[PDB]
Amino acid sequence: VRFLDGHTPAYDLTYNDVFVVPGRSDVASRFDVDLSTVDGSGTTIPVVVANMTAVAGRRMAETVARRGGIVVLPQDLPITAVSETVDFVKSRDLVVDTPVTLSPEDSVSDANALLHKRAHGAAVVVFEGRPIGLVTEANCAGVDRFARVRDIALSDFVTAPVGTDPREVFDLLEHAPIDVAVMTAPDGTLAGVLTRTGAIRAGIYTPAVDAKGRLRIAAAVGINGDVGAKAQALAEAGADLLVIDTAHGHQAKMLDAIKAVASLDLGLPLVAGNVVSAEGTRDLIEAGASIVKVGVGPGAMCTTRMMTGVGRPQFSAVVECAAAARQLGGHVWADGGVRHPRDVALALAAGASNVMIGSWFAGTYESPGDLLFDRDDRPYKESYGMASKRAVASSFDRARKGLFEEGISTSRMSLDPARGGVEDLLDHITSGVRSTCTYVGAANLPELHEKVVLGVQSAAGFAEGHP
Amino acid sequence: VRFLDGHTPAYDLTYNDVFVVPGRSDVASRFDVDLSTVDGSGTTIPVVVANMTAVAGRRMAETVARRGGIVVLPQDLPITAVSETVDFVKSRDLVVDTPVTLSPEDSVSDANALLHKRAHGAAVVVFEGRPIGLVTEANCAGVDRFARVRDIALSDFVTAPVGTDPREVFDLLEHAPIDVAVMTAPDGTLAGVLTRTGAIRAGIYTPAVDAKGRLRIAAAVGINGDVGAKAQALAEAGADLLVIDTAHGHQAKMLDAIKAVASLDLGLPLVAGNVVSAEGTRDLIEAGASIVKVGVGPGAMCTTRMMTGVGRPQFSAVVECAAAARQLGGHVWADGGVRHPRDVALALAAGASNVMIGSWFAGTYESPGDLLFDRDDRPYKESYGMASKRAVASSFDRARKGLFEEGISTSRMSLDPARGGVEDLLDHITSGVRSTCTYVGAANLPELHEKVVLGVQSAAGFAEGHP
Amino acid sequence: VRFLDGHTPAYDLTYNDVFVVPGRSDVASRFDVDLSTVDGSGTTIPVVVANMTAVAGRRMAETVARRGGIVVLPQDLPITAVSETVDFVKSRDLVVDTPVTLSPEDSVSDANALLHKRAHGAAVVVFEGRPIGLVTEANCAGVDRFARVRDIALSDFVTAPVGTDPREVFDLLEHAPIDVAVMTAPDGTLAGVLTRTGAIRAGIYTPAVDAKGRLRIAAAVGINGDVGAKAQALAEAGADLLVIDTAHGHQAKMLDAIKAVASLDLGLPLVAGNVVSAEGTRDLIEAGASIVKVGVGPGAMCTTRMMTGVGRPQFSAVVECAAAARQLGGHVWADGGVRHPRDVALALAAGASNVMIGSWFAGTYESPGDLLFDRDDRPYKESYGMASKRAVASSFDRARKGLFEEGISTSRMSLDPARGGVEDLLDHITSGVRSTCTYVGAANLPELHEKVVLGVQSAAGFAEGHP
Ligand SMILES: Nc1nc2c(ncn2[C@@H]2O[C@H](COP(=O)(O)O)[C@@H](O)[C@H]2O)c(=O)[nH]1
Ligand SMILES: Nc1nc2c(ncn2[C@@H]2O[C@H](COP(=O)(O)O)[C@@H](O)[C@H]2O)c(=O)[nH]1
Ligand SMILES: Nc1nc2c(ncn2[C@@H]2O[C@H](COP(=O)(O)O)[C@@H](O)[C@H]2O)c(=O)[nH]1
Ligand SMILES: Nc1nc2c(ncn2[C@@H]2O[C@H](COP(=O)(O)O)[C@@H](O)[C@H]2O)c(=O)[nH]1
Ligand SMILES: Nc1nc2c(ncn2[C@@H]2O[C@H](COP(=O)(O)O)[C@@H](O)[C@H]2O)c(=O)[nH]1
Ligand SMILES: Nc1nc2c(ncn2[C@@H]2O[C@H](COP(=O)(O)O)[C@@H](O)[C@H]2O)c(=O)[nH]1
């Protein structure tokens, strides 16, 4: 990667340690650059939700797939649930988001708890397949918590048939007091709910789809047990992308698993990780892997840095591994150490074809967790690490193995009081990345990597700018 | 008044010191009792807003008059403003509330500041006399504060012609996401805005009107200066009720002013105060006064208790003065010491034909004050005493008089975060009074006075019940 | 009632205002006095759980019935649920408490939430009707929240057949690390769980049973609607005691309802309330009521004192009504104003044949509510008032009635960090009452009423003693 004159430090670079120098730009606006990835995962944005049991669910899968990003299902899940989630995701409209369907016999407490499942801010009360009312935080408040939803003072909704251009739903909702609108099928049955900002995003973002035009989905597999059989079964379950994840991706078990999956000839791209060394990436590439995940330790849920001292500054690892993979022709997605959109922008700047966010999406409306409330009423959610789920494995043996196993770390990921949904944070990330391209002056991600000028940044440098 | 057996205390009774014992009741529901007053002020509810410069304005005047209560304009106001307010109030629809009219050239900051002028929670953007949009706290937030209101994302409103029964506006607004509705004149021009709870109140409350069917209004006059000329001028200005208010209503100046106003033969009922003694009430009645205001010191803005030790427990004073006036045939409105609806209920229980609330309405949306915000974002407003305005009066003389004048007391009257409007607190007061009648078993206020059973209550007794 | 020489106040007496002077005693120990009630409700202790939707459930019903107290089911409940609760209560062992039955397929989160349903502190994992393990707060902590209960490290339990005397289960559990013990049926199926303190209470308390030896239960009915049909249906549902409750028990609707129920000849004792006057009690007695509930306003969830000023100090009302009822031969249970066991002791001292606790049991493990946790981890629960459920009653009519309806008051009732169960607080109340009898020197409640010496107590007097 390009480096500024006189910048020869005797130290590695992390996201906390780097900045990009803007260059001569010909890109007029941020909308003139495309974020389509070259890695072959078929995501139009370089954002993938990590394989978290607390952050990767069907709601995030469908939402991010409609927004143009891949979602990797967490490992150690019964294949029945995997198939159910895949079928649910593949049966989603390409433009309209699936709302919170509410049966008339649901309680007010259940409706209130379900209202925060999505970022729309409203849930649809549907009877016999036809939407009959709308609920929100306003009408729900004050009424008895275990009363039925049939007397929650259903509000009026803007009804339009499926197929209208986003312009029509937008200006129809220009003066609507409620941001959401019920997208209705031609027969009158409810097909989904589309929002004002959703209408805006329908043109900016192009959903990531497979050859059959269905929302792409991914899943993660470990190394313990028969990796080949599990990978083949998940591939038949409908997963578009297969990911092999482990705490240490440079062990011989990783190489054996990658070799087995490559020999399976499943046809899906191969994803392995994580390694923070160039030699590990070359070994994984030679083992039959197309994609190499990088980063062990910088992960916000990773504890091994404090317990063992292992790890690496993320930015130097990602740039070195990306250079090695491009020398071997492979492609790399950065994983770990992501807390701000600048982290994502630098991760693509280092050369990564795609990015792995991780625990940041734990603070979303659609994450598969419980939105509990603190004293200050600030919404937030708890992010968990997998620990043994990314580690290679009788009651005696189980307890003996678990004694030395690192505990499941817990953090309080705060929700934005206004922009709490995954949609607007994704918008922020995409806007930051587009601004990075405009400052560099690149029309696409490969040009962003080629034409970037990269500097080293210290701790005192972050005092510059608004936090 | 009726007193419980064995209750012969050697001490006076205040609102803090009394309770009412329920008796045999024949009134089925609270809606079966009428709150029409006998005092002749023509108010269908026993609530009058005090003569506060910070609490008595045109908005409170019109709102409370439409709700069935009289409003007394504060003294020491230029008669031009008095006439303007009277003309504004007399030109108000009997059912629909006047909204916050917003010209399209107003700024976002002005719109936000005006939105809290009324309890509707929304303001009407009106162009060429026709309403074109609706604004609220939702669309106003986020947009630039000094941007025009023409790009504040006006919302849709429910439009109905003037004359529809409250049932029609109610069920038309049953499923409306916005509580307010634009009441439009037959020609298409805006006539007012009516709310869901306003539609509910349109049947429960009957507005207080004069012989010409216009919202009744009242004004206050002092004793300093020519009382007769000022009273005659305000009567010609359109004030329905004339009130003579002073700190001490038992002085000879009060008697002279009452005699002059009675000799004026203005035709309006005579109101004088305040006296906390029976002999003062008899003197005021003999001076030519029909109504005697009672209470000096219990007022939440009154300071004379702490400065001089003067005053009286309110409840004993009001009951004694009401008994004296009924013996002389006069009628009395209790003034001061009102903080809870139980205070109002006891004030009517003592025998008062009407009640004076005072500083409690300072914590309202419609009060003529500035709604400032604290750290906890709790809305509140400051209540001021008149001081010298209720006291009998060169730079030397002015400063010499002002040195000994009691300072303008200031208090922080908190707004209810949900029920901040004057409408819902008035509803609470009326519900409490109706519950008092139902517990007593009285069909009207005279029966409430006649059939009430009254007990004495100590400090430890208030620990009973939910605060 | 007996009154101390020179005690002729001109003021009523509440629980905050009274104390009992100990007299010449012949009762050696507290265990030598019996708390059997004379009112005919058949409760061996003078404690009844109020008709609260948040405090009266099947768990409280069975627990308090086994402890010797009646439980009144709240009104406005579908008779199907009433019949289900009655059948559940009547099918409870006379000595052993019903534990928290846990299926092996339950999650750790569900087990943790259910563990606080009872005061035992442990839940039984039962498979095919046979208990296979024990869970508590210790083994549940640390393990994954959505893991199955089959791998929660089930502990060992003390197994005994049903029929062993409490001595045997006590000394068998003398050195048991776990207080609870699984009471097993002779065939091996689980019949219940009995605790060490439960074994202790099995001799002190005698469960309240009907003629068929089944745990007695009670239910509450309002006055709106057909009172006779509802009362007859609940009587056929299996309710032992019928209670007619309303906000104002002196209205003509109350008299009509009592007359109808008395004419029904249902055979159950008649309970009506609440009235705080002797004349109301006489009217209710003449209407065909055997029991008169007393107290409106002192209730910790009652708001009418602050809204309307109505009410009465509880102690004077209860003593006067008890004297009137005993003159007419009727019996009275005090209701409202109960926060300490001294309140109960004085309520029986005033002459009440039984006591109504109310919101105090809202802070229990077995109350039908959600045990949420604060920052200080102190357990507590929210107590609600019925409001309109104790008041006499289209969308327009519904909303119009609800506008004037008093809001559902909410309070934070703190749980004792150690003695959080209903069992130990009931023990405290019974110990206080027994101590009161010992200080008076009475062998039973009628002797307690007859031989009591009663004094008046001020606010400064409560500073005596440990709070
Ligand atoms: N009634 C209802 N429940 C829903 C809906 N969407 C999600 N849920 C609830 O959420 C569960 C799945 O949570 P998730 O894995 O999507 O975060 C479902 O099993 C169901 O309980 C909906 O539209 N309606
Ligand atoms: N060793 C280890 N790595 C973890 C754990 N939880 C998450 N990670 C890693 O950290 C990444 C997420 O971190 P983030 O990108 O949110 O900072 C995951 O995708 C995974 O690679 C854990 O418990 N142990
Ligand atoms: N533009 C506008 N200002 C209003 C409206 N109602 C009240 N105001 C503002 O409030 C002032 C009077 O305040 P008030 O005495 O009613 O509390 C007016 O002079 C004006 O500045 C309205 O409908 N539109
Ligand atoms: N002496 C005196 N009385 C006041 C003052 N401000 C208000 N009051 C009295 O107190 C009443 C309002 O008190 P409130 O009814 O709110 O407790 C007024 O109507 C007036 O009679 C003041 O500054 N001085
Ligand atoms: N699995 C299980 N749930 C119980 C048990 N006891 C109570 N519950 C739960 O508590 C509900 C009733 O709550 P309650 O009305 O008893 O407070 C039941 O419907 C069930 O969900 C028990 O022994 N086992
Ligand atoms: N008027 C009224 N009384 C209530 C309300 N909630 C409870 N109560 C009364 O207060 C009693 C409980 O009060 P406690 O005995 O807990 O102080 C109830 O049994 C009932 O008589 C309410 O919302 N309104």
From Swiss-Prot, chains A, B, C:
Cofactor binding remark: Activity is highest with Rb(+), followed by K(+), NH4(+) and Cs(+).
GO BP term, pick one: IMP salvage
E.C. numbers: 1.7.1.7
Enzyme class: oxidoreductase
InterPro entries hit by this protein: Aldolase_TIM (IPR013785), CBS_dom (IPR000644), CBS_dom_sf (IPR046342), GMP_reductase (IPR050139), GUAB1 (IPR005991), IMP_DH (IPR005990), IMP_DH_GMPRt (IPR001093)
Stored SMART domains: IMPDH
Residues the record lists as binding NADP(+): D245, T246, A247, G295, V296, G297
Pathway: Purine metabolism; IMP biosynthesis via salvage pathway
pH behavior: Optimum pH is 7.4-7.8.
Gene3D superfamilies: Aldolase class I (3.20.20.70)
Cofactor(s) named in the record: a monovalent cation
Keywords from the UniProt entry: Allosteric enzyme, CBS domain, NADP, Oxidoreductase, Purine salvage, Repeat
Pfam families documented for this protein: CBS, IMPDH
Tagged with keyword Repeat: yes
Self-association state and partner proteins as the record states: Homooctamer composed of two tetramers. The oligomerization state is regulated by ligands and pH.
Function according to Swiss-Prot or TrEMBL: Involved in the purine-salvage pathway. Catalyzes the NADPH-dependent conversion of GMP to IMP. Is not essential for viability, but may contribute to the regulation of the purine nucleotide pool by recycling GMP to IMP.
Protein name per its UniProtKB record: GMP reductase
Lineage, highest ranks first: Bacteria, Bacillati, Actinomycetota, Actinomycetes, Mycobacteriales
